[PDB]
Design a protein around this ligand. Sequence first.
Ligand SMILES: [Cl-]
Ligand SMILES: [Mg+2]
Ligand SMILES: [Mg+2]
Lengths: 384, 395
Amino acid sequence: SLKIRDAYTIVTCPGRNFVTLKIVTESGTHGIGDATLNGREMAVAAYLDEHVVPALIGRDAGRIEDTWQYLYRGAYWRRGPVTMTAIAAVDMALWDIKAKAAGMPLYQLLGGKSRERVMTYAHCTGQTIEDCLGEVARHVELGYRAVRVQSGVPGSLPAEHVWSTEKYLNHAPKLFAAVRERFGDDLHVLHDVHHRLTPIEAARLGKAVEPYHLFWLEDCVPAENQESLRLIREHTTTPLAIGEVFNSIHDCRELIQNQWIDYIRMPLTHGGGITAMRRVADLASLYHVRTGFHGPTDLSPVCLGAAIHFDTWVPNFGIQEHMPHTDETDAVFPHDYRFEDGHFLAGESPGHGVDIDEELAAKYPYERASLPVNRLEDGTLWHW
Amino acid sequence: SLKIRDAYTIVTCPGRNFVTLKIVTESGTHGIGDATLNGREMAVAAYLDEHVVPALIGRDAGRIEDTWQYLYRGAYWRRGPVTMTAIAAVDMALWDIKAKAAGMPLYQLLGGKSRERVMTYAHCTGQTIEDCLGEVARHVELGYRAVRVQSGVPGIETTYYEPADSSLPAEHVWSTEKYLNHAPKLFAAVRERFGDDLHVLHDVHHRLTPIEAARLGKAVEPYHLFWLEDCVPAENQESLRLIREHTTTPLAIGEVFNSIHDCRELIQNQWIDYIRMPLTHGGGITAMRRVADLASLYHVRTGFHGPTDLSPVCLGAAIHFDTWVPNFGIQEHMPHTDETDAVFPHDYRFEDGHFLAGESPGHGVDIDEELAAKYPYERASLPVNRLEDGTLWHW
Ligand SMILES: [Cl-]
Ligand SMILES: [Mg+2]
Ligand SMILES: [Mg+2]
């Protein structure tokens, strides 16, 4: 393997912000990794630019494991979203370089294909239940076998939304009943609670939606305290998914080992890269837990390409979220993964199959954009 | 309550790097908060500059709790050293403002004094055991009632003073077995020369596995350590169980934590005796009050991390906190340089081995921005540790 000659970040906004890390070896071979942390992007950019990048110069790029441990342990302050995203970007770039050196697409390096295609789900959202059903129909036509459904509840800086738990709990089952009435049983139907309930509230929701057989009920409750899942699991057989806001195996080890969830959602970019996520997937597999990588637009095509490779190999694959990037984003990040009849197909190019067009990236300057916050009707700052 | 008219960071290196957040209200009143994260300073600087500061403008400065929740929950990505340090800086600055508004020193706002002075410990280090003993003698004469003792390990070139000593991480070498065979000799020697009154502390600094730390704890029981600190890496909190079940040497942990969720189980299971997470890295006064209160239910006491890499702003606020908190254990003292002290004027005092909280309204610390500008940032990273075979280990 060859030494790192150069490493640098690229920041671009082709429809939204992305941060990318590029590593270049003495042979000229290079790899890239996603470093995007939505709404806190420059924290990661600075973590990389000032503290990590300079330490990479001269390192042996082949030493993926050593580098991961060096950045993880060597930071002294361990775990965290900025921290683990910086580490993920390095890790992804190094796996890219290793696969290129091997002359293999990334999935081959990981252990080869376990499946012929990677099932996705699409976001189907409407203001009304009827609007949502319209979106489902349009996505089913495109070949999506699974859909995440959400509808309105009647009644630069962060936007401020208002929330009512009880109005939502009383309304949500109506959406799922309408989805089943219109589409029947074959369709996989997913729902994202987006952190807003307490455990016994989520247990009530879980029970209420059992007749609709959801693929998963996602992020029922904030789970910094992993025990938060216990009451839900004890009271419902609706499958549960969690973890897009996680960055470490230590955020979910207990959730997994106690069989409190069915799908782990932590993605490559935020969960410490391929190196770390293999270990999470493997722990999950001991307990029948499957992968369900977060895949919003705010993870770049670099992450998506690598995710599709990972998805193609991992035995306990569950599903891959798909929120299509804009044409501008796809142009900045040329890639060889393909979408066909509701599924991804991994690329065959050595590496994870994604590149970055630096000249085109430079046409789209960073523009600050923040995630919304949520407040209760009395003004209480809540979970968004 | 007044609105925030301005907010900004100040970066300065009067001997080492500090990052400070300053918040200014409509009336001109201001507060400051420590934002320093040793070896990753610019990540926090950017977190604040690019993402938090712009959202602070126009907010009601009196709404400390709401602002804490807004930044913690609103980030979406929760916890973590960069995240929680940024939040702590805001929180500290806002408590500073509130205490000034109340016309009270911070400890009064928290519930008043629980003690008349704040006991500290000093760092005593030397290449040989004899060198270390000379330092103990020197600090005991200064009035320290407590000392953390560290000495070199024969057959090991470098062991765990400003650790962030290079632009890029220095590479140290480590041998667990040489350390385990040697360390008890240090404590034996300290007790032989100084007797039983002195509080003696030791920092294992993350290098052992649980059963190894169990062995060490047992071996040092005769020497009655105040605490054995950071025995094992503790992302998996269960890592403390074997140690606790095998030794009665008191245990301290947590300088590398940033959330109550990093130590909830350690505390509730009674696996530690002292919690070390400090204000700057632990989400500020708002969060650390809750951590200290959970700890008190289980006889756990506070032992705030107090290295040079937390600024006088943190130290001053820590001393106020220490003065009020019922379950106070001890306050670490690593003296700042004269230049650092000049850049952050403050009213806490050190007398006869103890801190005395200030009496001026606020946390009693300010920053001289004109002076701070005279000391430019200089990157400094913490070292890494490798085993003798080259394995990247825990520093
Ligand atoms: Cl972080
Ligand atoms: Mg989600
Ligand atoms: Mg320590």
